[PDB]
Amino acid sequence: GIAEAAFNKGETAMTINGPWAWSNIDTSKVGSGSGSGSGSQATWKEKDGAVEAEDRVTIDFTGSVDGEEFEGGKASDFVLAMGQGRMIPGFEDGIKGHKAGEEFTIDVTFPEEYHAENLKGKAAKFAINLKKVEERELPELT
């Protein structure tokens, strides 16, 4: 489970599903997912040139989904290993064949596995700069 990778005080939660549940146990939707997470990251090094099909990059993502602004479903300085079942099938590409520091738009389709109410199988678009191909262990207000 992902709770082993990142130290969580909640129950040993299995590997994250790509489509993120904005609607929480406050709405009585998901189980006990009340937590910001307090762990530590493994150390990263800078990637030269472009991001590869196997390579990891610290991304950033925020925007709308089919023109609808979805609050809850965004993350800054997110440390993305691509082509992982933990993340959406949109991250099969999006970062590939280009560098960080540049700003771009990518449209990614959320799967039919989406465990949310308003959000179901619809495509999102992230018009945002790729954060860094470098390290970003425990990113905060720097």
Q: Locate the domains of the chain by residue range.
A: 1-142
The two tokens of residue 82 are 């691509």
Give the list of residues 6+ apart from residue 14 with CB closer than 8 angstroms, or none.
1, 2, 3
| Cα-Cα end-to-end distance for the chain | 30
The values of phi and psi at residue 104, to 5°, are -155, 170
Residue with tokens 């009340």: 34
How far is residue 82 CA from its own chain's centroid? 10
Experimental technique used to determine this entry: NMR
What are the Cα distances from residue 138, in Å, to 94, 98, 101, 120, 135? Answer: 23, 25, 20, 31, 10
| Residue (of 58, 47, 98, 99) closest to 80 by Cα position | 58
CB 23 within 8 A of CB 29: yes
Q: What letter does residue 117 receive in the DSSP assignment?
A: S
- CA dihedral 3→8→13→14, nearest 10 degrees, is -10
